[PDB]
Enzyme design. Structure first.
Site, PDB file in Angstrom:
ATOM      1  N   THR A 178      64.964   0.132 -28.379  1.00 25.66           N
ATOM      2  CA  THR A 178      64.499   1.356 -28.913  1.00 25.66           C
ATOM      3  C   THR A 178      64.923   2.421 -27.954  1.00 25.66           C
ATOM      4  OG1 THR A 178      62.410   1.242 -28.489  1.00 25.66           O
ATOM      5  CG2 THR A 178      62.849   0.376 -30.176  1.00 25.66           C
ATOM      6  N   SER A 179      64.805   3.708 -28.663  1.00 19.53           N
ATOM      7  CA  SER A 179      64.938   5.036 -27.843  1.00 19.53           C
ATOM      8  C   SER A 179      63.705   5.138 -27.261  1.00 19.53           C
ATOM      9  CB  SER A 179      65.283   6.264 -28.797  1.00 19.53           C
ATOM     10  OG  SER A 179      65.246   7.347 -28.052  1.00 19.53           O
TER      11      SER A 179
ATOM     12  N   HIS B 293      63.434   0.673 -20.296  1.00 20.46           N
ATOM     13  CA  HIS B 293      63.021  -0.802 -20.940  1.00 20.46           C
ATOM     14  C   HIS B 293      63.125  -1.746 -19.728  1.00 20.46           C
ATOM     15  CE1 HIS B 293      62.553   0.043 -25.216  1.00 20.46           C
ATOM     16  NE2 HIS B 293      63.931   0.702 -24.895  1.00 20.46           N
ATOM     17  N   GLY B 294      62.231  -2.874 -19.512  1.00 19.47           N
ATOM     18  CA  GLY B 294      62.276  -3.960 -18.637  1.00 19.47           C
ATOM     19  C   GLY B 294      61.462  -5.112 -19.031  1.00 19.47           C
TER      20      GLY B 294
ATOM     21  N   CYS C  46      58.429  -2.432 -18.840  1.00 15.87           N
ATOM     22  CA  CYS C  46      57.619  -3.540 -19.116  1.00 15.87           C
ATOM     23  C   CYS C  46      57.885  -4.727 -17.934  1.00 15.87           C
ATOM     24  CB  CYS C  46      57.783  -3.955 -20.397  1.00 15.87           C
ATOM     25  SG  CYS C  46      56.923  -3.064 -21.682  1.00 15.87           S
TER      26      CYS C  46
END
Ligand code: NA
Ligand code: NA
Lengths: 4, 240, 240, 4
Positions: free
Chosen positions: C34-35, C93-94, C135
């Site tokens: 996601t953005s 993100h992660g 994350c």
């Protein structure tokens, strides 16, 4: 010296 | 009264709290794990060091994985209402995220989960300190010449070594990390905040120790400990 | 001269150093990611915050995994001799140990390895700070009502969240962690040592934020950030 | 609120  | 600040944990409860030391030296032969020579030096140093910080110290030796879990469960079900903090020291073989009982591994998560803010209510809001002398893998450091709170809040992990790395123990002198930790606590616990004490420990281990081995693979290696803080306040072992 | 102490990093080099901000908002559709609404608020806040600490800020937006690695490699091969420190901020993100480029994952180890004491000599002995909003897994915190040095030395990881946990970002306000971090740096960078600033950040995130969702699974959740220090000295952004 |  030793490693755990 | 006048202006008040609350940037530091309340450490003037009637008791400082428990210091549980699990000292695993001898392992069941079937595990293939070596005897941890020097670990008794560590355990004795920790006992004396935390005794003088006014912790109620309990030393336990050579516990199975089952005994470690039952010990931690039982301790977490005590009433800690009159205690300022909780300290657990683990001396053993290990891997990343794992500490060894004498007969096999325990997940560190299993141990620390007992003390979650929602699972040990008399320690909610109080610092919970886990001090771990154990490997976190097999990497070697070659060195270089020069209304609610989270349930995971208020934990501090003082790891002897960086993620993924071996941790070093001297059979005569004790482990690099524990000997440095006790020294810095002796010298600075009446003077410095705990993160700053642990930072002095990082420097001492980093600068003053280097392995000696007849085995090239294991010779001339270095170590940096690893402070992992989920604390929400400053921690001083003394009080006004 | 008189007695000297060296418990704090030298931060009076001609330059404070670089602050590299990698702001990944938009991801290739094939990744299914996601953005990251709100991340521009974070990037702008960080830029201004570290500008006022006198860091040379470089903002980079929407980098592929390849671009992230080449950026870090190139930066680590600059001459940092006149710089006091190095700062890298990752917004993406992660998962545990991983940050996403716009087209796929990068190991954090790959990024940080460029700056090892033996691989970036002009940063040897200087603090290397990695600030990570991403994350580290999918757990949710339900809360509870109330002559050589190691090559891995002198790193600090300021993680937005505990190991294994999601990290929260508000689409309007920015991420809980980055907004709290900038606030505490603004207020305390001329007053407190860095571990104590980050501890204030832990408390702010822990106490002032709680998720709101129409989805029960994701509603009323909490977050604690995670300070990981391999530093060997105290870090003050000011100097005498 | 969204997760990263
Ligand atoms: Na050690
Ligand atoms: Na956050």
């Amino acid at each position: 010296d030793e490693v755990d | 009264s006048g202006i008040s600040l609350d940037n530091s944990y309340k450490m003037d409860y009637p008791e400082m709290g428990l210091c549980i030391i699990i000292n695993n030296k001898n392992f069941h032969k079937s595990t293939g794990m070596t005897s941890r020579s020097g670990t008794d030096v560590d355990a004795a140093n920790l006992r004396e060091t935390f005794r003088n910080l006014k912790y109620e110290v309990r030393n336990k030796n050579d516990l199975t994985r089952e005994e470690i879990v039952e010990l931690m469960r039982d301790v977490s079900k005590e009433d800690h209402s009159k205690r300022s903090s909780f300290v657990c020291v683990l001396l053993s073989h290990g891997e990343e995220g794992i500490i060894f009982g004498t007969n096999g591994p325990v997940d560190l998560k299993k141990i620390t989960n007992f003390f979650r803010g929602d699972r040990c209510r008399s320690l909610t809001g109080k610092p919970k300190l886990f001090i771990i002398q154990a490997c976190r893998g097999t990497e070697l450091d070659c060195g270089i010449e020069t209304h609610k709170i989270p349930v995971a809040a208020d934990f501090l992990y003082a790891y002897s070594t960086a993620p993924g790395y071996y941790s070093w123990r001297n059979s005569k002198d004790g482990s690099w990390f524990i000997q440095s930790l006790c020294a810095m606590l002796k010298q600075y616990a009446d003077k410095l905040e705990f993160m700053h004490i642990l930072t002095r420990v990082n420097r001492k281990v980093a600068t003053e120790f280097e392995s000696f081995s007849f085995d090239a693979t294991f010779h001339a290696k270095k170590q940096i400990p690893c402070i992992v803080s989920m604390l929400t306040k400053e921690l001083y072992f003394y009080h006004h």
